């Protein structure tokens, strides 16, 4: 799983719409990019994309946390935010029914 570090200058927010989900593989709850806002900070930066997992915010992990704990952590971010992101794999575990 490819992991990268993305640093953003917040325009109005990071220009990101997120969701709490469990990876089909995982038992640990995670924060994922549901979609990117065109023309927002993450869009212009050009790295982040729907499906990417947000591992940490400002060095503090987002993995396995309550939706309350994670929301608190997002509201506390500076004008500048550094994310560790697990890039969505080409070869990936998924759940079929």
């Amino acid at each position: 799983p490819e992991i990268i570090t993305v640093t953003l200058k917040k325009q109005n927010g990071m220009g990101l719409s997120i969701v709490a989900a469990k990876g089909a593989g995982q038992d640990k709850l995670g924060i994922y990019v549901k979609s990117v806002v065109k023309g927002g900070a993450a869009d212009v930066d050009g790295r982040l994309a729907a499906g990417d997992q947000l591992l940490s915010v400002d060095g503090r992990s987002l993995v396995g946390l309550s939706q309350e704990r994670a929301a608190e952590l997002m509201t506390r971010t500076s004008s500048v935010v550094t994310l560790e992101v697990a890039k969505q794999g080409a070869i990936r575990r998924e759940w079929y029914v």
Copy 2:
């Protein structure tokens, strides 16, 4: 929130790729349609779509359950399955960052 009942004749499975997530509004974990397989049972039926929440399977609720409990419930389904689905709203709660 519009709720409907969809009954499917399983071809090879329902032709559905699902995910466990929390609605931005919700604290209850849910089963959602991540994507539909073209040419699968749900596709041909034409009702189900990415974003829809799967409320119950065969009359048994999928809301708020462990990923183990839900997977067990999906593997137990007959050649015929009846789902209660909460259609993804146009006006909906979402989580921006």
